[PDB]
Amino acid sequence: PLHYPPVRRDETVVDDYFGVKVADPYRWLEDPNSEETKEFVDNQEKLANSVLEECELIDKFKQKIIDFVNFPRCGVPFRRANKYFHFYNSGLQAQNVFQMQDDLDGKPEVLYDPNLREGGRSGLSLYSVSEDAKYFAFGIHSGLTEWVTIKILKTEDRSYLPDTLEWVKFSPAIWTHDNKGFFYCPYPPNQEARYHFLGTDQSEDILLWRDLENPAHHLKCQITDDGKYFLLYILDGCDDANKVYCLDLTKLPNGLESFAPFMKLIDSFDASYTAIANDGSVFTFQTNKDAPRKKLVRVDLNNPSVWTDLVPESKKDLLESAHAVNENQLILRYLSDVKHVLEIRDLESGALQHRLPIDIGSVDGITARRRDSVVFFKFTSILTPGIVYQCDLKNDPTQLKIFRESVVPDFDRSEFEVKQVFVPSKDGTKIPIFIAARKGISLDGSHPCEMHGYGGFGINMMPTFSASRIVFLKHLGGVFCLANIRGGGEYGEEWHKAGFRDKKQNVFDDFISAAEYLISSGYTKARRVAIEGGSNGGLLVAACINQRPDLFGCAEANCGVMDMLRFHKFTLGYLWTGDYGCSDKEEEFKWLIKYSPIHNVRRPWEQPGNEETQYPATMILTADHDDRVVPLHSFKLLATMQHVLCTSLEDSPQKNPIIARIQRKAAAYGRATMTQIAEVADRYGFMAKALEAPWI
C-alpha cells in the first residue's frame, strides 16, 4: 500500500551517441550536493523505512545474525624476527584489532585498536611491520574520504613516531632490511614511488618513479625476501597485466640517499608478472604470458632475454598464486573447477612433491616468507566459519594441523550440505554453480532461493562463510546458489575474456541460465528466486531483471554500476573501460546501450504473452558518499525504474516495491560489524517479504 515521492524530470537533457538520441531526464542527480538531490535521498529514505517497517522479520534476522557472528576470530599469524602478528576479534567488535605476541600461544598484546577511533567506523587496510619487529606502519582514514594517513608505532612501548605521511590510498609500506625506512606509493598534494626514512618529514622522501606522460598508470611494489631488490610494478587499468622494473639496492654507492636506474625487465603491458623468489639475479615469476591459466617461469636478470618454464601451464587448472617457503620449496595454490588444490614443490627443479586437494570452500592468506618453515593459511566455507591451518614443512610436511578453529554458536553443520553442479548456458558453455541447502529437501519447486554472482574483472567467486546465509538456510528454509559465471577468472583469462567487452552479455545469459536450472531441477520456482550482487555484481542484478523480470521475485543490487554510457566520467570509473568498453567509441557504445540498466527499463506487461509479468521487488543499496561507484548510478536507476514502472501510470500493475536502502555517513570501505549486520538484516527481511517466505 505504497506512496512514491515526486521526482523531477528534466526533459531538455538529450545527447547524441553516433546518431542515437539518448535522453537523460535525471542528469541532475549526478550532483550529490544540490538540495534537490538531498531532498531526493530524504524522500527515498522515508519511503524505504516505510516499506521496511512492513517487513516484520528484520528484527528476527538481525538477532540470529548477531548470535551467529558472536564467536572469537584469530586471523592468520605472520612472523617478523621473533614476534608473531595477527588480527583478532572477540566476536562483535566493530573492527578487528591488531595484536602481537612473542610465542604463538603466548600472551597477546594489543598493538593498535581501531575501535577506539571514530567508534571503529573503519578498520586497518594498510598494516606493515618492519623486519626487526620494532616498527608498525599503518593506515588511518581521516574522514569519509578514501585518503589514508600513514603513522608509525614502536612495538616495544606502543608509542608513535612523529612521522606523518599524507596523500596515500592503497599503497603498502615496504620495509628495507636495514630497518631505516620503507617504500610507499603516494599521490601528489599521477601516482609516485617514494622511499621514506624513519625520523624525517614527508617533504624529505626520496622520489623513485613518476611518469607525467602517463598520468593514469598506477603502481604496486615489493621487495625481495633477501632484501637486495626493490621491484616496481606498473599497471594500466584493472587489466591483469603489468610491467616489472627492478632496482638492485646492493649496487647503490650511498644506499637510497643517492637520488632512478631501474633494470626494465618488462617494459610493456602484454602480460602479468609476479615475483615469487630469487637467488641472486635468478628470478622465478608467476605469469600469464602465453598461458591464460598461468605458470611459473625463470629468468636471470643478467641475461633477461631468456625465459624458461619452471612449472608449465596446466591444461585445465588456474595457478592462482605461488609462495616460496622453507628455503627451497614452493606452495602452489591451484584453482581446479572452483576448488582449491595445494601443491608442494621443489623451488629449484619445480618438481611436484605433495598434492593436497581441498574440500569445497576457499584457502587464502598464505603470508609465510621463504625463510619460514611453518606455513599458515585460512580456510572457510559455506558451512565452515574459519579454520587457521598450519603446515610445518620441516618436521611434518604431509599433514595439515588445526591451529585455530572458529565455532558458530548453536549451529549444527551436519543438517546442511553443499554440492557443486554444472549447468548449460545459452551458447552451450558449462557453468559451475554451488548449491547449499538443508539435507534431504524435496525438489518440489517450493523453496525460496537466493542466487549470488559477480561476473567480471578476473575475480574468482569462492564459497566462503557468511553467517547471515546460515540464517537464510536455517530459519527461512532457503536454498543458496553461488554462480561462477564468465567474466570471472575461475578458468583463467579465456573465461575472463568470454564475459567482457563485446561478450559482456554472456555473463548475464550464464546467470539467467543458472536460475533456469534451479527452477527446472525443482529447487525453487519462477518468482521465488532472489538475486544479489555488488558493484559489477550490481550491474549483473540490474541487467538481469531488465532482461528476464519474469524469473525473479526479489532483487538486491549493492553499489551497482547502472549507467554504462557515463560511468567512465566519474572518480575511478575510467579504470573499468578494460572490461566494459567506453561509450566514446561507436563499436563499444553498441555493446553498452543494449544492457546499460538505466537505458533498458521497460514495462514487461506491454509485451505480447507477458501481461502477467512485473519487475521483482527491488532494493537498491548504496552509501550517499561512495567515491568508487558514485551513487548517481544507483539513484538514476531508481528514479528511472520508479517512473517507467510506477509513477508514469495512474494505476500500475507494478505492485512489487522499488526502493533504495541508503546508508548515511558511510564510505565504500571498512564497514563496521553491526553497521554491516543492520544492512544485511534489512535486505534479508525485505527478501523474506518479497518471496512470501515464512520464518522457522
Binding site: 571503529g120 554491516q676 544485511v680
Partner: peptide
C-alpha cells in the same frame, strides 16, 4: 580485513 563474516 573484514570485521566479521556476515
Amino acid at each position: 580485513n573484514a570485521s566479521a563474516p556476515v
